Design a protein around this ligand. Sequence first.
Ligand SMILES: CC[C@@](O)(C(=O)O)c1cc2n(c(=O)c1CO)Cc1cc3c(CN(C)C)c(O)ccc3nc1-2
Length: 565
Amino acid sequence: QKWKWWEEERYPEGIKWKFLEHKGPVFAPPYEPLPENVKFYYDGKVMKLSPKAEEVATFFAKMLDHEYTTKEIFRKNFFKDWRKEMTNEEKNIITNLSKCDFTQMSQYFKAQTEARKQMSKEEKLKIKEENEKLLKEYGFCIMDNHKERIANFKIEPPGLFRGRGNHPKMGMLKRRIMPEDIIINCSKDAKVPSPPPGHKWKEVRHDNKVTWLVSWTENIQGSIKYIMLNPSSRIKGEKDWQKYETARRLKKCVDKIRNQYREDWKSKEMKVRQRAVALYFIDKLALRAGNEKEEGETADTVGCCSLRVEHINLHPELDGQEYVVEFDFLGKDSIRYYNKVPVEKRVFKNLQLFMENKQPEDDLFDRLNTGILNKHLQDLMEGLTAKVFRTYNASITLQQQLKELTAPDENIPAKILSYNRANRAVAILCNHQRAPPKTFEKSMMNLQTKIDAKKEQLADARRDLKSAKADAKVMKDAKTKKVVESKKKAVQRLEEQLMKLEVQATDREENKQIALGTSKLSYLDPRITVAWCKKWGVPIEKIYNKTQREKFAWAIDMADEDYEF
DNA sequence: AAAAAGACTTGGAAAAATTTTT
DNA sequence: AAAAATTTTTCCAAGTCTTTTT
Ligand SMILES: CC[C@@](O)(C(=O)O)c1cc2n(c(=O)c1CO)Cc1cc3c(CN(C)C)c(O)ccc3nc1-2
């Protein structure tokens, strides 16, 4: 069965579902204590830890190879959290982390990882079958007349928080999620999932205004985490289709918005000038609407509305270009945004006024926040927010670049190179940067030797065709002419093979510091890709893998080769 | 309001399983 | 067969925007 939810009458506003039934979450397996021979040492002397304290110790031991375990913040936060898990008898002995020895514990886990890759075919297939039967029973929920898959039904096991970038809470313990922390959401007429025996759920609710099945609060940030349906479901896919339709509606009114914000740079009021400059930044450079965050709780990262004076450096002339704004800051996930961008005269002049009488720690856009900006965007067009510009600019750039880089007469490997260069332009615009693959970038040597070995085969084939043509001169007959034909086809087959290898080598080189995944799955109206694939006869499986094909099932079925964003 | 909460949106590096070279 | 290069799951957070509290 294949449910085409996209052919149904669109789901009404307010209510998300009428019926909802699931078996609840799968809890992480219990902690298995260390055997007798794996010893922990404090001040050089043997010490057996209580299960609760031993568990927290194993987490640090497993991370001993990383440099972050030597960091002040990591160690401070870890030790404070490990103390809470210790008994009173253990707290009187273990005064500090530095006198502790986790070396035997670290070696054991490395030995287990080695003992696991040396498992038998009977053991390997068994664990794979235990995993598959867990997916049949708990990986599916029933939502309104249909069986839909659940994304992450297995709750993440306990461990140590690290986060991304320079996070103030690195080292902290992420405690084991218990049934007592779980809030279940289902309909009043559904069979309520039973908790593990000897346990109870925190709450069983019936809120049809939300899309989640299970929720709980995590101890690091104090936020609510959820278990929702998978990307191939109606509830996720319809909202994704709507996100793209909203981005298409912005397209038909973007010049009208551009002309107004350009005029708003000249306004009498400062709040209107700042709002217009911030809008320009979100449009031209596709910056995220930086929401304000609590200091000392998260890693110091900013976006457009949260930019500080220290994040921009103004230059009247740089590189022979007029009115350059040197952007240098950490955006989402602590990914550095560096750009030297030529702006209009009025923006540069406006930026000099927003930087007047301010200290480096002060906000560039005072009197402005994401709420004020989105309240204005909502008046310009219904349902328009700041992130819609990122979606619009990404999708329109993909469409225009595929239209400009794709050559009709090219073979499939060459067209995939044109597709990837177009996706690359989107990733550069969105700043989806990447650090060169951990050494492993020397796999460019391996590709070059295979290319040089193929250039050898081609050069040998050209010598065969050369002597076949010379043998066709002396004693010209229809038997020697057919040998020249077969040698020409042999040169042709080898030329195509080399072309494919050289195209793959270029693809990897240009993609060294670029991450394509995020724009491909979140930013890029899949219909633009489907339309391109059908137009040039490029099979969809060459662009989207199995999981992406399932998420974008709606676009693959409902989209002609003539679709225009 | 305007903080505080709640509810959605937005992988890539490392492992491991395979596959290919040797 | 055994080392090496690939293709595929496994691990682990952070923003945006909407809705409630204070
Ligand atoms: C790396 C790119 C990115 O950070 C991003 O913002 O551009 C991201 C992260 C994550 N995801 C994505 O789709 C995307 C891309 O759009 C899904 C995801 C799941 C994560 C989970 C799993 N949860 C949902 C159960 C974690 O536990 C920790 C971090 C996680 N990070 C991500």
